[PDB]
Design a protein around this nucleic acid. Sequence first.
RNA 1: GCGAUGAUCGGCAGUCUGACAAGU
RNA 2: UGAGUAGUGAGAAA
Lengths: 168, 238, 403, 121
Amino acid sequence: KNDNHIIQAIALLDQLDKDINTFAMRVKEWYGWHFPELAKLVPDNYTFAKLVLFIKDKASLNDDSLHDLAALLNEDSGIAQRVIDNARISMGQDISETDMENVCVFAQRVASLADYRRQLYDYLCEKMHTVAPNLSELIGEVIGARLISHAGSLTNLSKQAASTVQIL
Amino acid sequence: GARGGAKVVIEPHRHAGVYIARGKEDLLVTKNMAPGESVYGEKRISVEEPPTKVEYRVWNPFRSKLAAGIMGGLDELFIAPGKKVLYLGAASGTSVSHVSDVVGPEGVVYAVEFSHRPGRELISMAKKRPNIIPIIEDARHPQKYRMLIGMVDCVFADVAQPDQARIIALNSHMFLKDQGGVVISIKANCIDSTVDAETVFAREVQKLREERIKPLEQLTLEPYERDHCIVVGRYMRS
Amino acid sequence: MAYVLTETSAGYALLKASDKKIYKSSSLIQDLDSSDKVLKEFKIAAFSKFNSAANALEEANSIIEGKVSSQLEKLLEEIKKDKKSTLIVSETKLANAINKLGLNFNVVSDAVTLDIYRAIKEYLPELLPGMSDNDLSKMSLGLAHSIGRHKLKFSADKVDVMIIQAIALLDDLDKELNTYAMRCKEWYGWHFPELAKIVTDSVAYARIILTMGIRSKASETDLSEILPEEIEERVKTAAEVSMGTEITQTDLDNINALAEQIVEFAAYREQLSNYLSARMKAIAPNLTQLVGELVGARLIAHSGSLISLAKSPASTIQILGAEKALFRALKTKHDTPKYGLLYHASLVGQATGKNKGKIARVLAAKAAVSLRYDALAEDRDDSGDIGLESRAKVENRLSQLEG
Amino acid sequence: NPKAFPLADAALTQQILDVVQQAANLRQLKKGANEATKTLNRGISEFIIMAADCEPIEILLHLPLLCEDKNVPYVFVPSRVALGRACGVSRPVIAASITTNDASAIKTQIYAVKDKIETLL
RNA sequence: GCGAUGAUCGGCAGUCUGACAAGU
RNA sequence: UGAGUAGUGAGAAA
């Protein structure tokens, strides 16, 4: 019957989402100097960190590496070809190995929290189905959890009248 | 007087890519290619246009020779949107950034510099402006950076050197198109302080004519600066 | 046959001119005004592209020095089959260098050829299929920067704009690790609320969750490496008499994941601290000696750059981080601050009473002297020596002032 | 001392120091690198005088960067002890700034030096 | 082939001063 | 030298 776990999950999940954005932006800045254009090529921040982790040095450009980074995401966007071409031709000033060591480690952090965020998000969905299968099925696992936290407890939400729930 | 949040009315200038801000006081402004920052601490103006927030940069005539040329009423400027400009004597982005603003994203600016210490500052600013290709090289030997520079519709030289006329010839001969633009900022003292200003300017015009450049107009830059004039000419290879 | 060596940011292009003495015609301007006639007049012979930026820059430097590069030599050799040919070259020095190679080419570098090199440069995007004008500019911009850094003696270990980011990274991580620590304390507090009072350190709090997951596990687990003897036994006694409720393994797994995150941030937070300090000891060694690493970083970050701080007077450096108090005092006809951000420096802490203000003035002035050395010294030795005597002078001032 | 450039000659240095003593008497002189740095920030400096023999010379090398940006003439004098005595102080002065005043009684002499320094630059 | 398991209504805001101080 | 870190509640459709 415990539903406090859901409330913690929502209050935590949004924290990760904002937080993943905050660190990921900084990864774009640090790697942005070494070769800025990937920050434009792959707008999706979560994808960007992986390509930086794989593509540390823009100079390292091989056809096999092109296939490997092509496997990352899909070539439908064509970024795999763009990065190989654009890496050959760019103004990004090479940064030191210690600087590069920070970026990959710093990028590795953004990957971990988003990885955990996905794990925690799955646990929320599993938990909501367990505690409130009707609510979760009726609207969704994420939305139902937010409503529960707004009321302060599942017992509170059931107690509220229909109009009160609507304005909640 | 011109405080940051004072609300002003922006209108186009006679020359394309140049804007005027009205109010209790008069200001010359150029659209910011990189909104949200100042290259050298200049005042910036915010406009809400449908709503998107476009930004403008104030052009200080006392810092930029070209802007003071605008206030004096230069009849023709070759620097305009969508034109390639070779800027010689690019000490930093004080003026090059504004020139980059006028040309816009479509146009390009070839900033040429020799001194190293101003050079690195110019490099830091070209990062924010993709259209600026900084060239830290001597303008006395254009062939060193010939691979790096395509053709330019106008050539701007603010270099304060006694032999600037030779440099304008070699660069214009190499990269300026036929009937192209040539605009020069002349300082009398650097060339020859012994003789009076009007003598200095007249001889420079004579050199410009010898090198197939025809003067179109001349303008003294007072009251903003003393002993300075801007010469506007066209390059006829024929 | 007449050959034109055209140099581009992408690579070397060799053009075959139909007229052996195209450079002796006075109507080159009209004969090369449009792209179509230029293509007819000039046909590509061989094109050696720069594979990488490093190769392009080594190629670019050889051009600037007038030396014939190995790639250019190979490219010219391919045309060696044509007996009694002319090679139009833009530069005289490169023409002289190519002549010394002994190639079967009458190398010409004349003023008239400038029109040929002129008209070619109008229409390079159209002459060279496969490369757009926007792309060519990107080779232009990039190669200029790479050439620029070496000419300027740019060194990767002397960029202060690491420092402005890293300190700003450190503050954010400090904030964020706190909030997560609060969440872990609350969430794990549900299964065992007594831990927060016993162990106050957030990192040690997380490690306990990792070592023992459930209170029943507390009886056998050893917390020695995380906690001293007196602390580890109190948590064990709390575990059996606790208030928290039992949790499922599913709940346990994710809270452990947080505890894994909590400890991990601390590991990187220490790493960034060591990375930052190394950055200061290379970019501003003298200040680190005088004011320190952390306070030195905040000073540089506040101005936005090392040069910007260097140009500021010592008076502004004294009250750099106290703008709110400064301007409140100035408007209200009241006393102004005297410490600013420098208050947390070690030397200020050693001072007492009104001597703190005096040392702040003395320290701020010496900071300016050291700062102008770090920023504006072309060949600074990474020793911090000017910081050392500057530190010594303030210490003597502190001793006599305190005495 | 390569870094101190351009450096005034003996005849010029005497003429400059003649200016500094007069401005000090007329309260038209700002003494010290920090105070000289301030004058450039406000744009109230006729020209800046630096001492070439300062060790480490760099402590005044910020002013040349400031002067060139603001188009303010500048010059090095070989001796700092001489500058302090010319300033009218008991301490050596490495940097000094002449404050702008078109109503000053020594205005003509200051401009005469300023033009010569501009020629020297 | 309707409805109480709910019809209807950027500003404040401006980056301190400058030759004396301590002892017999 | 001086100098502040609380929606309503039975209609609706024809």
